C-alpha cells in the first residue's frame, strides 16, 4: 500500500555567524527516520524512528559521511547561485532539495522525485519520466544545459531505482509494527459565549493518530459544508493531532445539529 521516499535537505546561509546551516531529514511514511544538523554540537545523523537504533553504526558513518560531504556542496552552490541571481553575500539565502523513490504497494516504484528550489521558488527539477529536466528561468536555466550534457539524469535514475528502494524496503520491514499505529479521535463539542444569540459550537478532535481526518456537521438532514470553521490539522505535540470545525446556532436552537468524525483509525 503506496509508501514514502524523501530527503528534504536545506543549507541556509548564515550572514553573521558565518557558515550556512544544513539539515537533512529522511521520511519514511509520513514518518521521520533520521535527521542530522550541522549546527548540533557534533553533527551526525541521529535515528528518529526508534527502530532505526536497530541499525548498525557502520550505517551511521557510512551515512554521516555522506552528510559531512553533502554539506560541502550546498555551500558551493549557494555562492554559484549568487552570481546568476546577482546578490550580495551579506544576505540570507535558502537552497532546498527534495528527492525520493515513489514507493509502490507490493514492491515496485512508480515515481521519481528530484527537485531543487532556490530562495523559496523551484529552481531546477527532474521530470516523471526520470530522464528530462524543467528549469524556471534563465539562470536556473544555465544549470540545465550544463547538467544536461554531463549526465545528471542518468546518475539519479540509477539511484532512484536502486540504492533507494533496497533501502526503503529495509526500513519498510524494519519498520512495520511502528509505522502501522494509529490513534482514535477523542472527540466532543462545546457551546460558546457567542453572537447575538447565535452560540458558536465546536467539534474537537483532540489528539488522533495520523493526520488524516475530516469532520462534518449535520443540520439534522444535511452536511453543512457549504458553511465555514474548522482548523488546519495542527500537531500537539506529543505525536498526535487536533482539529476543530464549527458552526453558528440559534439561541437554544439546538434543533437538530449533528457531526460525523472520519478517521480511519476509527469505524464511525
Amino acid at each position: 500500500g503506496p509508501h514514502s521516499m524523501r530527503y528534504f535537505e536545506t543549507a541556509v546561509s548564515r550572514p553573521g555567524l558565518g557558515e550556512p546551516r544544513y539539515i537533512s531529514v529522511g521520511y519514511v511514511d509520513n514518518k521521520e527516520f533520521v535527521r542530522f544538523d550541522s549546527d548540533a554540537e557534533n553533527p551526525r545523523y541521529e535515528p528518529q524512528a526508534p527502530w532505526m537504533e536497530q541499525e548498525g553504526p557502520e550505517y551511521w558513518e557510512r551515512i554521516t559521511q555522506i552528510a559531512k560531504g553533502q554539506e560541502q556542496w550546498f555551500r558551493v552552490n549557494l555562492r554559484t547561485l549568487l552570481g546568476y541571481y546577482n546578490q550580495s553575500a551579506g544576505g540570507t539565502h535558502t537552497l532546498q532539495w527534495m528527492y525520493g523513490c515513489d514507493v509502490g504497494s507490493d514492491g515496485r516504484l512508480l515515481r521519481g522525485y528530484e527537485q531543487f528550489a532556490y530562495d523559496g521558488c523551484d529552481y531546477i527539477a527532474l521530470n516523471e519520466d526520470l530522464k528530462t529536466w524543467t528549469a524556471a528561468d534563465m539562470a536556473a536555466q544555465i544549470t540545465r544545459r550544463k547538467w544536461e550534457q554531463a549526465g545528471a539524469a542518468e546518475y539519479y535514475r540509477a539511484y532512484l531505482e536502486g540504492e533507494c528502494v533496497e533501502w526503503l524496503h529495509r526500513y519498510l520491514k524494519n519498520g512495520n509494527a511502528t509505522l502501522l499505529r494509529t490513534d482514535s479521535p477523542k472527540a466532543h463539542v462545546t457551546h460558546h459565549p457567542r453572537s447575538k444569540g447565535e452560540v458558536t459550537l465546536r467539534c474537537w478532535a483532540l489528539g488522533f493518530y495520523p493526520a488524516d481526518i475530516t469532520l462534518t456537521w449535520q443540520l439534522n438532514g444535511e452536511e453543512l459544508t457549504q458553511d465555514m470553521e474548522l482548523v488546519e490539522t495542527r500537531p500537539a505535540g506529543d505525536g498526535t493531532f487536533q482539529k476543530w470545525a464549527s458552526v453558528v446556532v440559534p439561541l437554544g436552537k439546538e434543533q437538530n445539529y449533528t457531526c460525523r468524525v472520519y478517521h480511519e483509525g476509527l469505524p464511525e
Binding site: 530527503y7 552528510a67 553533502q70 554559484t80 547561485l81 545528471a152 539519479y156 539511484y159 533501502w167
Partner: peptide, 9 residues
Amino acid sequence: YPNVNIHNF
C-alpha cells in the same frame, strides 16, 4: 540512504 550530489550548479 541519501545520495552523493556530485555535480555542481
